C-alpha cells in the first residue's frame, strides 16, 4: 500500500521547530509524483537527489520531519547553514540527501491577536548535531552565578515565542516545512518509488 505522506503534509497542526516532529516511513510504495504536485510550495530544494529520480529509487527508511518557522528563516533549512534555527533547533548535515519543502501557512498558523504556540530555542551553549532534537526547558545560564531553575538576570528561559499575526510581512509570517530524509543502509529496502 501507499506511503502516508498525507498524514504529514495535511496535518491539521504542526510542531514547534525546537520540538520538530519526525515520521518514520517504512514498508510501503511511495507515490512521489502525486505528492509533489498537490499543494503549491514556496520553497522546493533537493540535495543529493532529484525529485523525478525518487520514483526509481528504493530506500530502507524514509523520514518526514515537519515544523513551523518564520519566513526569513526558511533559508536556514539547508545543508551547511548557520543561525538560531539551524544551530539550536533543526540542523541538516553537510552531506544531506533529501528535499526541503516549505509553504506559507499564514492562513493556518497566525491569529489576529497573535499565535504564541509556536516556539523556537533561542539560547543554547553549543550547536546541535545533525537531526538532533532538544526539547529541554532548563533555565539558561548566561553568567557566572547559577540560576537554580529561576529566570532572572543572566538566567533566561531557553524558548522564545513567535507570535504570528496575519497582516505581518511575509518574512515574519509562519511557514510549514517538510524535510524528506532518505536513509540508505546495507539492509533490505522497504520504501520504493
Amino acid at each position: 500500500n501507499l506511503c502516508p505522506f498525507g498524514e504529514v503534509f495535511n496535518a491539521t497542526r504542526f510542531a514547534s521547530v525546537y520540538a520538530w516532529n519526525r515520521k518514520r516511513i517504512s514498508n510501503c510504495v511511495a507515490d512521489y509524483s502525486v505528492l509533489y504536485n498537490s499543494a503549491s510550495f514556496s520553497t522546493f530544494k533537493c540535495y543529493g537527489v532529484s525529485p523525478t529520480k525518487l520514483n526509481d529509487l528504493c530506500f530502507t527508511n524514509v523520514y518526514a520531519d515537519s515544523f513551523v518557522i518564520r519566513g526569513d528563516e526558511v533559508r536556514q533549512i539547508a545543508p551547511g547553514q548557520t543561525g538560531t534555527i539551524a544551530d539550536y533547533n533543526y540542523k541538516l548535515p553537510d552531506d544531506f540527501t533529501g528535499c526541503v519543502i516549505a509553504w506559507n501557512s499564514n492562513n493556518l498558523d497566525s491569529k489576529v491577536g497573535g499565535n504564541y504556540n509556536y516556539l523556537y530555542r533561542l539560547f543554547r551553549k553549543s550547536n546541535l548535531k545533525p537531526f538532533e532534537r532538544d526539547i529541554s526547558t532548563e533555565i539558561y545560564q548566561a553568567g557566572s552565578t547559577p540560576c537554580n531553575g529561576v529566570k532572572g538576570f543572566n538566567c533566561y528561559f531557553p524558548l522564545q515565542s513567535y507570535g504570528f499575526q496575519p497582516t505581518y510581512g511575509v518574512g515574519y509570517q509562519p511557514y510549514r516545512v517538510v524535510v524528506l530524509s532518505f536513509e540508505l543502509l546495507h539492509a533490505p529496502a522497504t520504501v520504493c518509488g
Epitope: 533537493c46 532529484s50 525529485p51 529520480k53
Partner: antibody, heavy 120, light 109 residues
Framework: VQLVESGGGVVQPGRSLRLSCAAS????????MHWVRQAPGKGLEWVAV????????YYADSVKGRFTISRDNSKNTLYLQMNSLRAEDTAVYYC??????????????WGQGTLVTVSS | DIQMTQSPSSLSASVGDRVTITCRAS??????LNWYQQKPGKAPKLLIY???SLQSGVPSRFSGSGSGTDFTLTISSLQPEDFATYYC??????????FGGGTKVEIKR
C-alpha cells in the same frame, strides 16, 4: 541522439514567445528535460526542468512565475513558454537531455540553441 | 546559493601540454560536479560527470578528480580542437544547478 530547437526570435518587453525542441533516437518518454540559457558574452544559467511524464515542473528563481515548461511524449518534443519577457532574458536558449546515470541532474546532450532577443 | 569558483579565468597552452583547471565550491557538493566544453558559437558538450566519470565518446585525454569543495579537470595531452571554454557545474543542489565562471583555454605564442 539529436535535439533540434526552434521558435526563437525578437520580442518586445512584456510580450510572449514559445520555444520548441524535438528529440530523437532515445526513449524520450522516460528522461527528464531541461532548459539552459546563456546571455551574450556571459556564462550558462539553468532555467527549468520537467519530469519524464510532465507532471512535475521546477524553475529557477529568476524565471519563476514567468516561464512555463511542457512536453508531449506521444510526439517526442519539448516546449518552453516565455511570458512577460524582460531585457535580461536576452540569451541563447538550449534544451538538454538529462543523463540518467546519477541520482542528480546533469546535461549529457544539448541542442544547438536558438537566440531570443528581447527589446522594443 | 552554491557558488562555483574556477581558476584561472583564462590560460595559454600549446598542443601536447598538460592542462589542469580548478573549480572550487562555496560548500561541500559531495561528488556531484560536472565538466562541460563549449566551442565559440556552439552548444556545450558534457565531458566529465560526477567529478570523475568519463562521458561516452569523450576522448581518453580528459579526466576529472576531486571531492567536497576542490575539483580538477585534466587534459593529459592538449590538442588543437581542445581550445574552448570549460565550465564546471555542481549538481548537489539539483533544483538550484549553478555553473562556474568558466576557463578559456587559449593558444600560446
Amino acid at each position: 541522439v539529436q535535439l533540434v530547437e526552434s521558435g526563437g526570435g525578437v520580442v518586445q518587453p512584456g510580450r510572449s514567445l514559445r520555444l520548441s525542441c524535438a528529440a530523437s533516437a532515445f526513449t524520450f518518454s522516460s528522461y527528464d528535460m531541461h532548459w539552459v540559457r546563456q546571455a551574450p558574452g556571459k556564462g550558462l544559467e539553468w532555467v527549468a526542468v520537467i519530469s519524464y511524464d510532465g507532471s512535475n515542473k521546477y524553475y529557477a528563481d529568476s524565471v519563476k512565475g514567468r516561464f512555463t515548461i511542457s512536453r508531449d511524449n506521444s510526439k517526442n518534443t519539448l516546449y518552453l513558454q516565455m511570458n512577460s519577457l524582460r531585457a535580461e532574458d536576452t540569451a541563447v536558449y538550449y534544451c538538454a537531455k538529462d543523463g540518467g546515470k546519477l541520482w542528480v541532474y546533469y546535461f549529457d546532450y544539448w541542442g544547438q540553441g536558438t537566440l531570443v532577443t528581447v527589446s522594443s | 546559493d552554491i557558488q562555483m569558483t574556477q581558476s584561472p579565468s583564462s590560460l595559454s597552452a600549446s598542443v601536447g601540454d598538460r592542462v589542469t583547471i580548478t573549480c572550487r565550491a562555496s560548500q561541500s557538493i559531495s561528488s556531484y560536479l560536472n565538466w562541460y566544453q563549449q566551442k565559440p558559437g556552439k552548444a556545450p558538450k558534457l565531458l566529465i560527470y560526477a567529478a570523475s566519470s568519463l562521458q561516452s565518446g569523450v576522448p581518453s585525454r580528459f579526466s576529472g578528480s576531486g571531492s567536497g569543495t576542490d575539483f580538477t579537470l585534466t587534459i593529459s595531452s592538449l590538442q588543437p580542437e581542445d581550445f574552448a571554454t570549460y565550465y564546471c557545474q555542481q549538481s548537489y543542489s539539483t533544483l538550484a544547478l549553478t555553473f562556474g565562471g568558466g576557463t578559456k583555454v587559449e593558444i600560446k605564442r
